[PDB]
């Protein structure tokens, strides 16, 4: 039995209305669960049986369906509604969740603040060399970032992490390592990040030069 | 009102064994079935097993039978979830869950479990200080080289809340890294000291690292 939900992500701007769907390969009649996750959370029971919602649950959230196909709608999405939601059927065993739906808040574009960090002496010490970038507070999530040595670009040993979405301000940030061994670091004078985001044409830079 | 606790998790090597525990209170445990979910790395929730109000009645999950065992303790309020015979496969955050009919009503923190066979290994903390000016400034600190999840970072003992951002882990040959950083007043630092803060439960590690001008 296998239970598929889409879309896969959705991103709404607050005040707009949407719906999820869920669907079983077999009739499941109303024996049909819905979940949220928010950050660092643990999943919430939002409406259960298909459409019988549970005490505390804005009435925003709308259950509906019956045997292969329901439906979980939201009317005016508010910036708390942010996170992760999934179905869950209650039928046939194994119990099973569908695949779930990230559902992100648009908000007004806002361009990163970029900070760059060599590395410390501490690192150098060990025979080790990370170059530390740091791009907060952007919206949207989308951004390129690249690295480049002495003017080359490059990707062989750079790590990059999002966070989540921010509770607060529905903004982002993610933090991009470029690590080398000590010996490489020191043949090179400047080490760029460079962030390409739709809030300019121009890509941000932010640069460190060994040499001063 | 109720509450769940479980605990237990841990790094296990692989064809291992492991047992989860879960403290129930605020409510009639032995009137209620109890049921083990799990949350994969691919963020995909995977229900597990679950206990009839009794005990009399385990489900499991068909990977995960004859490997697991699933029982409860009705006047010791605790739920278990013995496993055996781990795999990478069996690698999530697993949460217990008390039952409404077939929805999972209520849930716990959760307990990650690591299946593998890389050591546990502390983290190296080092200082992000800005190379040698703006009304705020931007510092931070890079964990380096842990195993397995999780670490906490706090900025001054908890002290400094605002400006923090922690991101989350990425996993890089067996270690993971992670970062995080914290903006102050530049009139501020290093006039006043900042220190990132790193607790590792896995190694009971804990270090302290200032954060001091280049």
């Known amino acids: 039995l296998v239970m598929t939900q889409t879309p896969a992500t959705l991103s709404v701007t607050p005040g707009d209305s949407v719906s999820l769907s869920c669907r079983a390969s077999?009739?499941?009649?109303?024996?049909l669960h819905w979940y949220q996750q928010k950050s660092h959370e643990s999943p919430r029971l939002l409406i259960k049986?298909?459409?019988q919602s549970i005490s505390g649950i804005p009435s925003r959230f709308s259950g509906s369906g019956s045997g292969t196909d329901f439906t979980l709608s939201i009317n005016s999405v508010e910036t708390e509604d942010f996170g992760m939601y999934f179905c869950?059927?209650?039928?046939?065993?194994?119990?099973?969740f569908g695949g779930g739906t990230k559902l992100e808040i648009k908000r007004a574009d806002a361009a990163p603040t970029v900070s760059i960090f060599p590395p410390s002496s501490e690192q150098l010490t060990s025979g080790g060399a990370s170059v530390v970038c740091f791009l907060n507070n952007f919206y949207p999530k989308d951004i390129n970032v690249k690295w480049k040595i002495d003017g080359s670009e490059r990707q062989n040993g750079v790590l990059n992490s999002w966070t989540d979405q921010d509770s607060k301000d529905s903004t982002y940030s993610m933090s991009s390592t470029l690590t080398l061994t000590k010996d490489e670091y020191e043949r090179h004078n400047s080490y760029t990040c460079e962030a390409t985001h739709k809030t300019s044409t121009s890509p941000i830079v932010k640069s460190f030069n060994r040499n001063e | 009102e109720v509450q769940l606790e479980e605990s237990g998790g841990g790094l296990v090597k692989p064809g291992g064994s492991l047992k989860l525990s879960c403290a129930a209170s605020?409510?009639?445990?032995?009137?209620?079935?109890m049921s083990w979910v799990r949350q994969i790395p691919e963020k995909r929730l995977e229900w597990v097993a679950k206990?009839?109000?009794?005990?009399?009645?385990?489900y499991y999950l068909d990977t995960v039978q004859g490997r697991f065992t699933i029982s409860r303790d009705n006047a010791k309020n605790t739920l278990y979830l013995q496993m055996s015979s781990l795999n990478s496969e069996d690698t999530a955050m697993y949460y217990c869950?008390?039952?409404?009919?077939?929805?999972?009503?209520?849930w716990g923190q959760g307990t990650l479990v690591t299946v593998s066979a890389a050591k546990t290994t502390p983290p190296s903390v080092y200082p992000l200080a800005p190379g040698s000016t703006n009304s705020m400034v931007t510092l931070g600190c890079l964990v380096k080289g842990y195993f397995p999840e999780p670490v906490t970072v706090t900025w001054n003992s908890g002290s400094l809340s605002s400006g923090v951002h922690t991101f989350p882990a990425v996993l890089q040959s067996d270690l993971y890294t992670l970062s995080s950083s914290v903006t102050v007043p530049s009139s501020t630092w290093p006039s006043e000291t900042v220190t990132c803060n790193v607790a590792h439960p896995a190694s009971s590690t804990k270090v302290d690292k200032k954060i001091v001008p280049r």
């Open positions: 049986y298909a459409s």
């Open positions: 206990v009839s109000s009794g005990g009399g009645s385990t």
């Open positions: 077999q009739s499941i009649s109303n024996h």
């Open positions: 869950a008390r039952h409404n009919y077939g929805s999972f009503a209520y």
């Open positions: 605020g409510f009639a445990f032995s009137s209620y079935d």
């Open positions: 869950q059927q209650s039928n046939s065993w194994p119990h099973t």
